[PDB]
């Protein structure tokens, strides 16, 4: 069981980095895919206008 | 829609505004102009090259006020006789009183055509005025669709 936990505690020390990235990325691909949203419905709101 | 004291700390940026009071009519709605007035020359001369070279806006509506150099009408002294130069061509211009023309004579001819000539002017100036009218109002129209369309540029930027 030590050794096992031993080698769990291991890898789960591994992932400090790649975890924290894929947590950026996916922030970042939420605010993008919002920001987006905003873009198609003000844009289409325009060109009705237009 | 505009205030005494709008322009009053509108223009308080250029320095300091001894009087900044709306033209208004009898009624009480805006002329359409204003008259400002600074304490230094200097100040007064930078403000107008900031406002010919820059875009001065005071409220909202996107519309900058154009500024011009302010010409005195006065109505105090109006013009006494002894300030005439009373020379030659005063007496040349004064061989007759001030009368009626008679109709069928060269000055009553001549008359009609200084009439004619007086009426042709304020119709190109009712003319000019349409004009400048029309392009007010159809740029003014046009609030929504050039604001949306430049949301829409700067935000895709």
Same mark, same amino acid.
């Given at each position: 069981v030590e050794k096992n936990m031993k080698d769990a505690k291991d890898k789960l020390e591994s992932e400090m980095e790649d975890a924290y990235h894929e947590h950026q990325a996916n922030l970042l691909r939420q605010d993008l895919m919002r920001r987006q949203e905003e873009l198609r419905r003000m844009e289409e709101l325009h060109s009705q206008e237009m | 829609y505009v205030s005494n004291e709008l322009l009053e700390e509108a223009f308080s940026v250029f320095g300091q505004v001894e009087r900044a009071v709306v033209i208004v009519d009898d009624r009480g709605r805006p002329s359409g102009k204003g008259i400002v007035e600074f304490s230094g020359k200097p100040a007064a001369r930078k403000a107008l090259d900031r406002c010919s070279e820059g875009s001065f806006l005071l409220t909202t509506f996107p519309r900058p006020v154009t500024v011009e150099p302010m010409d005195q009408l006065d109505d +105090?002294?109006?013009?006494? +006789? &002894?300030?005439?130069? &009373?020379?030659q061509q005063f007496h040349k211009e004064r061989e007759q009183p001030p009368r009626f023309a008679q109709p069928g004579s060269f000055e009553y001819e001549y008359a009609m055509r200084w009439k004619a000539l007086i009426e042709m002017e304020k119709q190109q100036q009712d003319q000019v005025d349409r004009n400048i009218k029309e392009a007010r109002e159809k740029l003014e129209m046009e609030m929504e669709a050039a604001r949306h369309e430049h949301q829409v540029m700067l935000m895709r930027q």
């Open positions: - | +105090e002294e109006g013009l006494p +006789e &002894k300030l005439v130069i &009373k020379n």
